[PDB]
Design an enzyme around this catalytic site. Sequence first.
Site, mmCIF file in Angstrom:
data_model
loop_
_atom_site.group_PDB
_atom_site.id
_atom_site.type_symbol
_atom_site.label_atom_id
_atom_site.label_comp_id
_atom_site.label_asym_id
_atom_site.label_seq_id
_atom_site.Cartn_x
_atom_site.Cartn_y
_atom_site.Cartn_z
ATOM 1 N N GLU D 193 0.810 -1.219 0.000
ATOM 2 C CA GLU D 193 0.000 0.000 0.000
ATOM 3 C C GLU D 193 0.848 1.277 0.000
ATOM 4 O OE1 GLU D 193 -2.664 0.324 3.281
ATOM 5 O OE2 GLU D 193 -3.437 2.278 2.661
ATOM 6 N N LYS D 235 -2.472 -2.177 -3.090
ATOM 7 C CA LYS D 235 -3.535 -1.352 -2.505
ATOM 8 C C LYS D 235 -3.231 0.129 -2.771
ATOM 9 C CE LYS D 235 -6.096 -0.650 1.935
ATOM 10 N NZ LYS D 235 -6.308 -1.148 3.354
#
Lengths: 359, 351, 351, 365
Positions: D193, D235
Amino acid sequence: HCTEYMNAPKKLPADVAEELATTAQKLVQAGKGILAADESTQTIKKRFDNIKLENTIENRASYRDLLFGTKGLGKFISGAILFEETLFQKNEAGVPMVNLLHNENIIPGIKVDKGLVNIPCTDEEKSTQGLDGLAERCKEYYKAGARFAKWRTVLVIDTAKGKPTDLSIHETAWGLARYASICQQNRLVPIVEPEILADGPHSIEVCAVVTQKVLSCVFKALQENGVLLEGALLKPNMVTAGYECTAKTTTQDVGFLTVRTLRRTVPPALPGVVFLSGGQSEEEASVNLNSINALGPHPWALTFSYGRALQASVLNTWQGKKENVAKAREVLLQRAEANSLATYGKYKGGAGASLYEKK
Amino acid sequence: CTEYMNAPKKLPADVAEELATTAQKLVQAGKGILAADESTQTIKKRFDNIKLENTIENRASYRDLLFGTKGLGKFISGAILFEETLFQKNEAGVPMVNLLHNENIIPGIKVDKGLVNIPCTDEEKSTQGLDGLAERCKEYYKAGARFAKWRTVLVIDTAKGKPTDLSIHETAWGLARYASICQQNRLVPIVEPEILADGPHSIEVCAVVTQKVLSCVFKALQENGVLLEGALLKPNMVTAGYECTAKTTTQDVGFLTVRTLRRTVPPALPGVVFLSGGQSEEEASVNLNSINALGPHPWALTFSYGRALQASVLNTWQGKKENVAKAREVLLQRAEANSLATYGKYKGGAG
Amino acid sequence: CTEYMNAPKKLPADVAEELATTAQKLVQAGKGILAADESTQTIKKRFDNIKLENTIENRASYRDLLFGTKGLGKFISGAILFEETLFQKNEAGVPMVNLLHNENIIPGIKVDKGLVNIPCTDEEKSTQGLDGLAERCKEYYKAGARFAKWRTVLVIDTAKGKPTDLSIHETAWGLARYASICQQNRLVPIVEPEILADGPHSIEVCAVVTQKVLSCVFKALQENGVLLEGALLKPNMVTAGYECTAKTTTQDVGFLTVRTLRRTVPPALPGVVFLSGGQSEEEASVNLNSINALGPHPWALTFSYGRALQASVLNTWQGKKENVAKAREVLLQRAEANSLATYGKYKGGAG
Amino acid sequence: HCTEYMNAPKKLPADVAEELATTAQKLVQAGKGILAADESTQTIKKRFDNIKLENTIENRASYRDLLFGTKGLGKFISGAILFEETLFQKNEAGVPMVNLLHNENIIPGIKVDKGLVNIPCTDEEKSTQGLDGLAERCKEYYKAGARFAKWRTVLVIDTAKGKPTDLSIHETAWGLARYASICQQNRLVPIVEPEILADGPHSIEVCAVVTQKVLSCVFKALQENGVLLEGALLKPNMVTAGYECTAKTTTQDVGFLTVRTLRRTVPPALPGVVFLSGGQSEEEASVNLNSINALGPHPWALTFSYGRALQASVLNTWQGKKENVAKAREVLLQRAEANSLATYGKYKGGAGGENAGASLYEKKY
């Protein structure tokens, strides 16, 4: 071959590496620097326009004869950068002009880049052309008598445009490294010139920040490509404020921030730095080089590769006239010695200023 | 206005759009590229076999033979030409580009100026060509060329750590400069980092190296602001070494090739046009078929074949124009064979 | 005037100035660093060779022995401490740090949390420590520490193409992060990329690798905005491999070591404090001498020695309180020996 | 031994590579996404304030019980990201929380980063801590039942300050790559992420430019650390304009520029992208994810890793009260199915699309 650590560039032959080292040391001899007389036909035209003269092959040959034929110039000049024409040129009396350098004991050099083009996807940031057929040109130039080379790249400082962009820095840095390694392979000491232009109103500190970033990147490329620093020279800009910066700094700042940024980025294996003068006046070129060298005994030779800064007055005190050659060379030695003194940190020029008393 | 300034800038809408459409056209379903870009020196070595003087008239009649084939454009989207051929006319005074335009093929141009050694490597290669390239591209686009080729060469020699880092980024950076100069001057660049098959390495080692090279190549392309949508990749297929590290199968070529591409090629790249290398005409088609049997891919997996499309076309010609009909037979045959391999529907002659 | 933004920002005048002066002090003329930063794990080994139990009282008495030597500050500029020792007191109940303050020696602190394997390498090492490091530094500065140490380890194994790129950049990047966190929190970082001497490689191969590693290390340092003027380097000397075959002269060690540093270390770095590695106490001094006989260098070339300063001090002590004065004599002897090496004026006279 | 190409990361053990691959595929199963339940005791303290209730271990356990004990949530949810506490937690009735998930056939995951700190020499740009002892925590988490991991890094867009600076980009990129490589070696699928924050008044195009640059850098880091893309997930932020930006943009533009920037930077070996939702409303999180997936079939699964976007209203209609658990669980399935439909490009919640706007005459012949 002889299975050692194989993901590192190979070494130059003992013989070539040793010759490159010696030439590089000679180029930055004590009290000596380089004369940039490598102006192109289009560039040297503009110099002849000032003094109302036609840009003919005879005029070019006589002017380079004027410069290279000066007695005792080799006292202050270690090498002379030439444009291709001049390397193969003769004076009116038929003497090869390279032999005028030979006789003053000055090493001939040759500009090998083929000029600038825009990098696409930048805002007109510049790439230096020249790699195609360079190896073959180098062999030819070494046979002609050239022992070192020049390749000029140009970066620009424009903060609000993030400018010298990353692309610009690595195009420049990589091209210089390719150039340098091709030269050394073919027995020419490369002068690596990443000129950061002084255009704009940026502070001297911003210039230091950028010049330091550029140089870190340049030397990283140099090591990537296996360039021998011992057989190479750097031609950087001095660290100055931009041309239109309202905060007018002084020669001592130029000296400090320039020496600082080189100390942070230039390994001592590099035998010397030959400063470009940019748009500096003849006198400032000398004053600032002096301020740099007052600041120490340095780990490398801090000297000069000057064209305009050595030639400006010589052209005005000549006007093409064969009569004025004597007085034109009078001035060249003057400037050559001025910068030779700056090399030592002993060029006075022309506080402790005091009206004194008595007892 | 308040642009994120430390990023390569975008192409102007108009040129970006034209590059994208050319690139899609070049990898049209069931179509691939004909590599007709042999230099005078390499083309003489082919004429050496058929025993004709490598004359300008011989070269023009051979390219006329190839480009003047009816229905070739059903299987061929573009043709990579040598500079000479781009400005050349056939024996009836007709431009070659017009023969391709009639047959609906896009003309392309080899723009590199060959290979030189990188100093401080063990004879690893740098591709020359950047000097004056922008100006040549303008000239080639005016001549009718809509795409370009630039070949770089890497070598696998494990024991010498070949692809050394220097070799990988000299190659990767040179391809990226080339590609961006093409695109600025309205040519779709074919980016070719050929990893040679020379040596005794396994197919897995080739996969490891091909993957490493490709990651490096694409990183350079992004660096230089290259539009992947207006660009094509011409990589080697992933095979074991020519010295047969226990001779692997075509199923293995197809898998390790598709894997390596899936790990390294973003889908914005509209297509991959494989180079044949030293593969026989049939092997070039069988392996391309095995690649495409592995199902609809995220990009067009097709061909840029020279030798793999021309080898038999040279034999059934012999220079004697009595075989122009017979030669064009074997061209269409091979072009359709690889068009079917594009679809994954090519047994070859039973299996 | 408005900053060029894509570059790491400066240190505050005040902190940059303090780091610079500490770094210069640490490499004072004729002085070097005492590595007393042995962890329990490793000092339990040395105590077990002189048959002593590894208790907190034994550790305190030994560091008291070392740091309480009168006239040690003549040859020693700083002492690298283990965390315990920095907050430790002697049997008398007086801070260990105060014994250094009294000899005017600067205290330092090992801040790394040891080594772990990099996955996808053949057991090449990553140095842990960055989590909570800033907060530890603030604590260590308050405890009296003015400089830090962080050891990373590379290995030379040509056949397995050791220091792999992954290893080189993990090492180089971790050192740069460490170094920057230290400087922000007012500690001079000693950057230690020890390339191990294990194996049969020649001294030239070591030079090649050490040069490559160092170029990479310093590149990472600038990336992260590390002030070289407020930093020190603790590299391996350039030697041939342990299990080589050549007799390996001390002059060759000095030359190739000096050469590799000249090619890679900018002069803004005020000094290099060499690690001894597996060298003997004397070989640590002879080789340091050979380095400095090669004439005034652009930086201070000195020592950060533990084993090379403590080996005989420990063996001529055996744990006994009587032998303290006698052990302290042996300490000063070695400290002066290396102090002389620093000038290029130590014993060794085979010529 | 036999010499392969040495200057290249070494592959995962066949067995481990294979397990990571299947977990990653399962996490992006057709019509499914991830529930982010990884709020720290600090983070969760702010959530209960708005529903008036206090932050105790019994309250936290009851809320996670509420979420994970929903019947048929596994129809729309493939995995659940947990905070450490919750992974080793039980409800009032002594049932382990991860067992609530096993029954619903949701894969448990674990947030493994130790938060953010400032990079020195940047203007407060963020470095994610966590690598120290991570390998050993992963072994523990896998034994606890976790099959995947989460590590959040944060970049900011501030064009005037050149701000996501090279240094910020490479600290982030390199830390995510080390994290990922350690997770995979210890049998956890890493969710990578690199959240580029939406703060500021920059255009959607500038965000695209930055997101693309960041992602190119991240993936370069992954490959060099030897991360298997097949056993990993991304992500990223959706590509949107800035929060302060005029008062403009449209959901189809978020969809186009997002899909474009992923096509240019994400190799298809990566089995899926699980979008974070940032400050988007629960409905916006679904509308935008729908607009992304309306843009034809994609080379990877484009789905969701939603915390607030799945929990906001569930939390409003629980109120900490045992009575309302059914009522809240109603809203959880509602939102979970809404985004499951957005996965298909088949969500329509109030609007639908752009056409004319009714008032149509019907002249039969």
